[PDB]
Design a binder for this molecule. Sequence first.
Ligand SMILES: CCOC(=O)Cc1ccncc1
Ligand SMILES: [Cl-]
Ligand SMILES: [Cl-]
Ligand SMILES: [Cl-]
Ligand SMILES: [Cl-]
Ligand SMILES: [Mn+2]
Length: 340
Amino acid sequence: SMTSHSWLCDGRLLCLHDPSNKNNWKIFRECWKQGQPVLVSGVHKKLKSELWKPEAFSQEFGDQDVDLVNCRNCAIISDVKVRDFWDGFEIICKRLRSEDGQPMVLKLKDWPPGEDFRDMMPTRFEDLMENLPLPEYTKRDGRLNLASRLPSYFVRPDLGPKMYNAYGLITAEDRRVGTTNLHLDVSDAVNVMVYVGIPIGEGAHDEEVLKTIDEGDADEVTKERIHDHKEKPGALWHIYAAKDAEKIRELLRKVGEEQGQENPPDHDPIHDQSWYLDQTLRKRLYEEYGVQGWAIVQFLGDAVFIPAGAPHQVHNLYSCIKVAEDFVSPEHVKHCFRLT
Ligand SMILES: CCOC(=O)Cc1ccncc1
Ligand SMILES: [Cl-]
Ligand SMILES: [Cl-]
Ligand SMILES: [Cl-]
Ligand SMILES: [Cl-]
Ligand SMILES: [Mn+2]
């Protein structure tokens, strides 16, 4: 039977089932006020699927100059063509190779650049903005989005949306690496999975994906979406409540010291965006500091709602195209205020 919602993370995470249900706000706002993330499934079924394919981006934009990042060592690949990224997205035999002769796991940096998404891609902009869930919160002019309404005493988000394009991590060693390291954002955001690319040539990398989800602390109900419904898993997230950010900084200062980093006692390891919490670090955070997070697997068409101030990290399981919009809900406006 169709139902309005269900729960993940053993009851701790709301999952809304119909992205365009006009009554979603009634269920959403109780969980959101408590500082929880929220998942909304099914957004892919609302979009024009031909606008969100890797081959389209390569054909239309391939001659643009860009920088890439090597996810394994954070090295910058400077001034290459955007087609050099897109043509290796799924076909492993086309990827740029490291000195060791292995295909690299790459992230496309700052593309489209700054605020240029709407000017560069007007049809994609319209397709995304008209199908975002919780539109009173997420649309630029929604009634519960304060972004356009606040004075300079508040940090205002840039005009969006922003795209996050990166290959999947592959090996046992890659399990300890981020696509994106732990950080936080002073505005709320909604992040939509618009495409998942499951590669070929090295096609059988499915068993290491199960061990990553299992060791990532994914709940038993999340594991059923793979084995029973055959949905495409894109990325593993860890999100932490905004109230736990300082305890996380204390853990990362202690580990920085143990590893022989030489850091002033007040430096900010979350703002530095230099850490990925692997299985060892997530267990130490729980045991030593009493902090529990949310382990979320984002499938094709899932929208992840990230509360302002909440630390989060992302580990792509397969190649992903994600598009995110920032907003300022009244529930979390304190996080962007510039005083006390
Ligand atoms: C969108 C998921 O893909 C990422 O790169 C992670 C990302 C998500 C949230 N904040 C920054 C980056
Ligand atoms: Cl809060
Ligand atoms: Cl477009
Ligand atoms: Cl709404
Ligand atoms: Cl990062
Ligand atoms: Mn973020």
